[PDB]
Amino acid sequence: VAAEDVVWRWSCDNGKCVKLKNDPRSSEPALSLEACKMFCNEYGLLWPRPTGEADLGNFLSKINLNSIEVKILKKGATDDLMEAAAKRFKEQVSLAIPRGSTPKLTGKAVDVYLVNENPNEKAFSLEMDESYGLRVSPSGADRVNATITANSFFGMRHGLETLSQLFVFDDIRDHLLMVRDVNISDKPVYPYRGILLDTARNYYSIESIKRTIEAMAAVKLNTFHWHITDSQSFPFVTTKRPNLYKFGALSPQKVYTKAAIREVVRFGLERGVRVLPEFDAPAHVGEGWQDTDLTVCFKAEPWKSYCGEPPCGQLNPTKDELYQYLEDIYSDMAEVFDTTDIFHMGGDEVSEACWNSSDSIQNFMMQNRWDLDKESFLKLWNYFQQKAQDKAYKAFGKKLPLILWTSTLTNYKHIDDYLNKDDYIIQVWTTGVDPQIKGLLEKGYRLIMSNYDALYFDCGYGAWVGAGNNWCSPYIGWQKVYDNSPAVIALEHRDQVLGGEAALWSEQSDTSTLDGRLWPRAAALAERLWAEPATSWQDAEYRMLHIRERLVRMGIQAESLQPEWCYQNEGYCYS
Amino acid sequence: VAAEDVVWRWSCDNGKCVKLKNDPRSSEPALSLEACKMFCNEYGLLWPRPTGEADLGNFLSKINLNSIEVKILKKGATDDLMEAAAKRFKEQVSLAIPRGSTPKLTGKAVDVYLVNENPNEKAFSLEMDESYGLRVSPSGADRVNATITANSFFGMRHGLETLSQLFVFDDIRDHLLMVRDVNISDKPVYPYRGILLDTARNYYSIESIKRTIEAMAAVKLNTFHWHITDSQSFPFVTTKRPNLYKFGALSPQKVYTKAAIREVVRFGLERGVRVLPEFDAPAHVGEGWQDTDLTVCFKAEPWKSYCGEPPCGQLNPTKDELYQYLEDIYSDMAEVFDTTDIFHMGGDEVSEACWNSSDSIQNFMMQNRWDLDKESFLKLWNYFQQKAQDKAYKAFGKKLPLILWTSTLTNYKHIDDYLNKDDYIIQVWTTGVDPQIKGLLEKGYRLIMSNYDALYFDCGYGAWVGAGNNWCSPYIGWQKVYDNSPAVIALEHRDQVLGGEAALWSEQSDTSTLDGRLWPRAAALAERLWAEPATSWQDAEYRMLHIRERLVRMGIQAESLQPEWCYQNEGYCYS
Ligand SMILES: CC(=O)N[C@H]1/C(=N/OC(=O)Nc2ccccc2)O[C@H](CO)[C@@H](O)[C@@H]1O
């Protein structure tokens, strides 16, 4: 076969790029699809779109791939991180070029200048500055000046990410192009932009976790919430209490060693991603605890009587030794997850029946004058949480914010009996319309939104117990994730919302299915959290298709949203 | 870290392998999970389970990986295919061994003997013999005799596949094991066991197509139905009418050349998979036909008025030149798809409105005394099909069976006016309970079942036009595909059912998402078609989990069905 050449061209008409034949008898220069898209779309090819200035100009300039140089103007303690970020950037620019295509090495030279105004700052915090400014302009006759200015390394890295998005490959001519005149100013609306990955229901290769982080960085998501343990498995390698992993793991290979974790944590830091660890308690414990006598109900049957899902099992708060185990686990986590400013302690629904089933437990309650009703079991949960919390603080070596899921414990009506708003952040998984949300906000609580009607990425597949479909079906499309707005959910109490997180529970997901589950749906969340657009999904639709293509180019096995024909023929596919 | 060793063992109790600690003070030999499973389960680790004799014995023998030799007893015209099949088999045995694990090179030597009774036979046909017999027994002191006897290469290749499934890796000891005493006899219930892949709505890499075929072969699926063109794109490289692909393709790279197609066809043949091509007509045409004047309504707006989905477009049957184009396309297909015994001609619903919209068309109808009502448009469709059919036969150089989808044309009430049962096979996509099915069967028609309620693999994701979920949602779980029985659907007219096919329409699928869409759900279909079990999904559940793990080992990014904990702890997860 003699491979053909691209035969089509694209022209902007009413905000839509229309495909037209590239006829020879024309004096007007043909535009490639991406080139037309960059100026046809209001925000061009950017995802997420910026919150401030977004001036992309009207032109593109041909660039030579081998002539891109990055210079770091202000040196500091973040030099290593900055140097790493710069290196990644050269590689990102290539992603513009489709695989198997080769650009002509001609054109201008690009100079990228990074101005990090506080070069020593590298800690993750809810108050950290993620803002940046980007300007691109012609410099002299043969080069381009790209200048990124930010208050911190984090803003600077976000700026490099936006800059990488200003490159387009012209497949008609085989030219690498770059936007000529750019003025951009940006910062995120919300500090916490996350993805929860459950690695206990099924194991995820460390390569996959890193790939996930690479994708997150590409859309300015900053938090990876590692739900490391559950009743099904204990893959965290705890040096202090090694039997938990030894007994706990699905296999000896299916484990997360200290070196692997440091590796992931560092990989995250370079990409502005906080790796936040969760040790869920006192429910969701099982495997790895055999022979300790520190749990009750593991594998209790019938399972339905004792828990939400099999296997059943919970910690026994009445055993003093448990707090010793917990201290050790929290300490081992703190050692390796050393960039995190926050610790998640789980707290999803505890089972009354399960606790009531232990005489050892009942005796303890009897001795303490408490009865055996629901109110009393709440007392037991609080007793546990208070003790666990002390251990967590001791482990991290300071008081730090702690996260808990919405639960019976966190009901706004009695939450103050147990928790306080300064010390606890509440992760919300109820529907976006649930009354608990307003009530919690009124009490001053900060929230992370993960409402299941919009943010549960596991939803919609086949049932994993029995037949039918899984519990939270239907499957949530990107359109729905995009339209779910925390600002709408919280109204006037908006500042109290820290952000949001997409949740990938793993009863039905693993190394193999993760790219699909997460991408590009998490990108919808990324834009929503970064920008809080007043606009709807339909306004972001064309760009969403582009970002999906970009994730694929990165090597992500992203879900397919629409026929490629739609991407090539804007406005034709609608409903 | 010092990697641990597996700490658990498994014991059979009431058909379930239960995990127990591998305690040192025991005189009873510990069993690894797969080893326990092989004898605990009624059919062991086999998928699909055999239809005849299935005696697996009670024991396992240690085997040396480097000592497996295959000898072909009867030579013939299929020598090349047999030699290829043998080579693949050595590689398959390794799949038993999990990645990064290394077996001890000790144990017996395995001799595999292949007896192909009709060594010259290599054609695909509905009447072909896929039966085989398998016996395994100890031979002498240091070796194993594995003998496969079949009427044809196809049965022989199915036998090698079953034999590869009789190997287990003992991860407790690092020993490769094989079932010691085996007697198996098998043949499929249905001749046509397929997967439809739509490569026009989105493009699929040829590497992906081959990977799909590898997975199919692993579960004895024998037909790959390539839905090569549609309105969205024309990736088939037709030498005779090169503009269709040149204009038609999503990109110059996104094409299927003759060499690629031969490559896929050959890869299929070696694995007992018929590669069946579909050129859908007269609807579902669009791209690639610009400037021919041979279509009407391409990109007609509003799309809803003229078609099921955008872009709209149909062939104009009144143009004589069209039949010339068609002859050329059919001829180009016949040249490269040279193993197929059947040709699929599409025929999914044609649009009346679209045809009525062309005066050129109306004039033709006016001249032929036909009116402009629905009945008349049916006449036009028949006129087209009759002419297209003649071209198809001329292209293939013989009369061969042709397949059409259920449609207005195929309504059993008037189907005989147009088609005949000898010449046409009807592919059914209505619900399994639709009256058309009984009516068609009563008229003597053969069917391929693809009922959308059970067999549409595209179903359940987000909407691709507008918001919500896609048209045939909910998502179909393996349980549902497994329970859908053609025997039940057809009753006494069972023989008329040729088999079944899972359909992966590609509006929302591509190279990236294909492993997930297809696997392991197609495996459910494979067993149902191969064996027609009276039993339900729950009886096949443990084995299904194993096959999924096997697909992953093969490199398939298969969907995750359940937590791995369930696989390790049978009977604990249920509902
Ligand atoms: C916080 C959370 O989501 N907890 C569990 C969880 N709990 O789900 C419910 O209990 N849903 C529910 C059941 C009855 C009534 C209301 C909600 O869902 C995930 C799967 O989607 C599990 O992986 C989690 O462990």
Ligand SMILES: CC(=O)N[C@H]1/C(=N/OC(=O)Nc2ccccc2)O[C@H](CO)[C@@H](O)[C@@H]1O
């Ligand atoms: C045979 C077939 O399935 N045809 C089209 C097709 N047609 O679907 C329907 O028209 N479904 C339907 C609509 C209204 C009433 C009954 C069925 O579905 C696939 C997507 O699932 C498309 O890719 C196919 O081109």
